[PDB]
Amino acid sequence: LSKVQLYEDLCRYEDTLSKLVESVDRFKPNLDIAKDLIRTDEALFENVKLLAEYDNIYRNLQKIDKDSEELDSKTRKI
């Protein structure tokens, strides 16, 4: 979990929202942690955009993985 960059991103996004809801439930809200949650939001949203890019690189990587394995099959059968 320490090698993937999205995981800690939603971890501290969840931590910021949980501490913010704890602060508003204890009736002492904070704006510095709201600014910190603002800092964590853009990383999440363009990480979602690069995950949409991950879908395309996964499908084209799968395409050349399958043509790699069929060319290997062709070599071993010949």
Query: CB–CB of 3/37 below 8 Å?
Result: no
Query: CB–CB of 33/16 below 8 Å?
Result: yes
Subset of 8-67 contacting another protein (CB under 8 A): 10, 13-14, 17-18, 21, 24-27, 29, 31, 34-35, 38, 41-42, 45, 48, 50-55, 57-61, 64, 67
Count of CB atoms within 10 A of residue 58's CB?
12
Which tokens go with 40?
A: 């964590």
Binding site for another protein (CB under 8 A): 3-7, 10, 13-14, 17-18, 21, 24-27, 29, 31, 34-35, 38, 41-42, 45, 48, 50-55, 57-61, 64, 67-68, 71-72, 74-75
